[PDB]
């Protein structure tokens, strides 16, 4: 499997590289390549100008694959290129504020080597569950990395007193008080005009924690953990469930219209569920599909890993994260059909609940149903189990695996195990989870199963020298996690627990106006959509 990954990365470096500057290329890479033509995936601007999309925030799995490949193979070329790419970004694409030209609304054109902004009214910095490889960055340039992290916090915190964050960060913003800002803890679900989204807080928690890890910065650690704790303090006193957000809308006006869901009318959950469920029916307490993926996977996996790695400095973080996942398993999970039940954090089961009025969560008449636990829950629950072997976390891992065609991992590790060695499962996430189960239990069947998945990944997803989700896909994504999974499998088998970075499920995206072939503008197009297109 190591030879395949080496082949693959060689292929990426051959076909995704800068071919626009003759014999003096930059080290930068295209995000996507059509494996049939070698054509690099382009952003098309309103006038028909074509940029080759180089978004460093959409390449941070590849940086990990590259470093992992070097550690396992002993070939230092891949590690060196990853380092060269970091160095070139600090040299050319880092603002005086410290922010990089990357993320949701900026990238670099590989052709011109100039920064781009595909969304003209949003020339801004955004990171959404990106989880960049700061370990590598600190290794290249510790000071420049620290400047990025301080500038990230400075740009994305609107009000330090109450920790109001923003999804969008302005470039060129002067340094404020930063870690020396005054904080005062507000009560659960205080009413405010702003909104600290969890998928904007995730990258803030992760970055400030890594600045602690590398520079022993007490200010960074304090604020990282304090921000994490904002989604913990308002948790339900009985159930320990929640919360998706920790504020509610400031009500300035009485509503006239169920279907007008503007925040000025007040918390949208209190409007639609409040009459029947009481004052605790609030947006942050709505444990619904998608929202629970953000809370109990996107956030939780990262906090689990941080809690562990922070050691003496992460005990509280880790406690909050494992306690939250345990509560969700206890209250909402159904292992028989592998579903989570829709709920309010106070413990109210909304399964088969008909919405009695229009609102933010659906039109009158909609029946709320249990939803299938996707593999983002498999990786968060298997990671949790690896740190704290609780039967409640096993329950979820077991239920999902069985629903994924993997057989029965047992009533507990090594007990009544009946895994399916003929599985056709080729999911990187399944591979990742099984490795965590193995490392917690030493039960050999779990790793034999992961080997099988790895073999399936190569047989069905290694295509034309790339990794693709389908054989018909137009463009391959150089940030594919298939080789990342294969590497962690190989590092387990070769007895190298330090060679490959624990998985955080980060990813990048690019969002803006994109010109269609007929010349029309498609507003808020994402590279995610481009990668789903077939030939
Ligand atoms: Mn945005």
N- to C-terminal separation? 28 Å
Number of domains: 3
| Count of alpha and pi helical runs | 16
Q: Let me know the number of strands.
A: 23
Give the second-level CATH assignment, the architecture of the largest domain: Alpha/alpha barrel
Strand content: 5-15%
Net shape: globular
Which CATH first-tier class of the largest domain would you pick?
A: Mainly Alpha
Helical content stands at: 40-55%
Biggest sheet statistics: 4 strands, antiparallel
User: What is the CA-atom radius of gyration, in angstroms?
Assistant: 23 Å
Stated plainly, the CATH topology of the largest domain is called Glycosyltransferase
What binds here, in terms of ligands, is: manganese (II) ion
Structural class, please?
alpha+beta
Question: Major sheet: order of its strands?
Answer: 2-3-4-5
Question: How would you explain this protein's 3D organization?
Answer:
The protein is α+β, with helices and mostly antiparallel strands and 535 residues long. It folds into three domains: 1-41 and 55-106 and 121-253 and 288-341 and 371-500, Glycosyltransferase (Alpha/alpha barrel), CATH 1.50.10; 42-54 and 107-120 and 510-535, SH3 type barrels (Roll); 254-287 and 342-370, Molybdopterin biosynthesis moea protein, domain 2 (Alpha-Beta Complex). It is built from 16 helices and 23 strands. It has helices at residues 2-15, 60-73, 77-92, 134-140, 142-156, 198-215, 218-229, 268-277, 291-309, 315-332, 375-387, 391-403, 428-441, 444-461, 482-493, 527-530; strands at residues 32-33, 42-44, 50-54, 107-109, 115-116, 157-159, 164-165, 190-192, 247-249, 286-287, 333-334, 339-340, 343-344, 353-354, 367-368, 371-372, 407-408, 418-419, 462-463, 466-467, 476-477, 511-515, 521-526. The strands form ten sheets. A four-stranded antiparallel sheet has the order 2-3-4-5, with no helix packed on it. Strands 11-12-16 form a three-stranded antiparallel sheet. Helix 2 (60-73) runs parallel beside helix 15 (482-493), helix 9 (291-309) packs parallel to helix 11 (375-387) and helix 11 (375-387) packs parallel to helix 13 (428-441). Bound molecules: manganese (II) ion. Residues 104-105, 122, 126, 167-168, 511 line the site of manganese (II) ion.
């Amino acid at each position: 499997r190591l030879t395949v990954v080496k082949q693959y990365v060689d292929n990426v470096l051959n076909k995704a590289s800068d071919t626009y500057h003759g014999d003096k290329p930059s080290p930068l890479l295209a995000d996507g390549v059509d494996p049939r033509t070698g054509q690099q995936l382009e952003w098309i601007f309103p006038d028909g100008r074509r940029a080759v999309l180089s978004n460093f925030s959409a390449q941070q799995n590849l940086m990990r694959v590259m470093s992992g490949l070097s550690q396992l193979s002993g070939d230092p070329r891949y590690q060196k290129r990853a380092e060269d790419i970091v160095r070139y970004h600090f040299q050319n694409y880092q603002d005086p504020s410290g922010l990089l030209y990357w993320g949701g609304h900026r990238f670099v054109d590989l052709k011109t080597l100039q920064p781009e902004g595909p969304s003209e009214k949003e020339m801004v910095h955004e990171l959404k569950n990106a989880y960049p490889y700061y370990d590598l960055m600190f290794s290249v340039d510790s000071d420049a990395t620290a400047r990025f992290i301080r500038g990230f916090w400075n740009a994305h915190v609107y009000d330090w007193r109450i920790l109001e964050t923003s999804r969008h960060g302005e470039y060129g913003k002067p340094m404020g008080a930063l870690w020396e800002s005054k904080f005062e803890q507000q009560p659960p679900f205080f009413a405010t005009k702003g909104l600290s989204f969890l998928n904007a807080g995730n990258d803030l928690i992760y970055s400030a924690s890594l600045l602690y890890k590398h520079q022993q910065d007490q200010g960074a650690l304090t604020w990282a953990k304090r921000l994490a704790d904002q989604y913990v303090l308002p948790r339900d006193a009985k159930t320990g469930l929640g919360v998706y957000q920790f504020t509610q809308a400031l009500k300035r006006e009485e509503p006239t219209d169920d279907a007008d869901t503007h925040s000025k009318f007040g918390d949208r959950a209190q409007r639609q569920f409040g009459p029947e469920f009481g004052p605790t029916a609030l947006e942050g307490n709505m444990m619904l599909k998608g929202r629970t993926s953000t809370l109990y996977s996107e956030n939780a996996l990262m906090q689990l890993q941080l809690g562990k790695d922070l050691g003496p400095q992460g005990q509280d973080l880790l406690k909050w994260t494992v306690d939250g996942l345990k509560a969700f398993a206890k209250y909402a999970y159904n292992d028989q059909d592998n579903t989570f039940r829709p709920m309010i954090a106070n413990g109210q089961d909304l399964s088969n609940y008909t919405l009695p009025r229009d609102g933010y969560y659906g039109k009158k008449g909609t029946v709320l149903k249990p939803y299938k636990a996707g593999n983002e829950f498999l990786i968060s629950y298997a990671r949790a189990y690896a740190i704290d072997n609780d039967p409640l976390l096993w329950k979820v891992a077991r239920g999902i695996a069985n629903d994924q065609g993997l057989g029965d991992i047992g009533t507990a590790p090594g007990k009544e195990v009946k895994v399916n060695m003929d599985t056709t499962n080729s999911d990187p996430y399944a591979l990742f989870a099984l490795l965590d189960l193995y490392h917690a239990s030493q039960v050999a069947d779990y790793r034999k199963l992961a080997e099988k998945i790895g073999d399936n990944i190569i047989k069905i997803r290694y295509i034309d020298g790339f990794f693709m989700a389908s054989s018909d896909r137009q463009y391959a994504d150089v940030d594919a996690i298939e080789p990342y999974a294969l590497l962690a499998l190989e590092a387990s088998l070769r007895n190298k627990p330090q060679a490959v970075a624990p998985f955080l499920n980060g990813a990048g995206f690019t969002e803006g106006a994109y010109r269609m072939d007929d010349g029309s503008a498609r507003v808020s197009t994402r590279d995610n959509e481009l990668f789903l297109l077939n030939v």
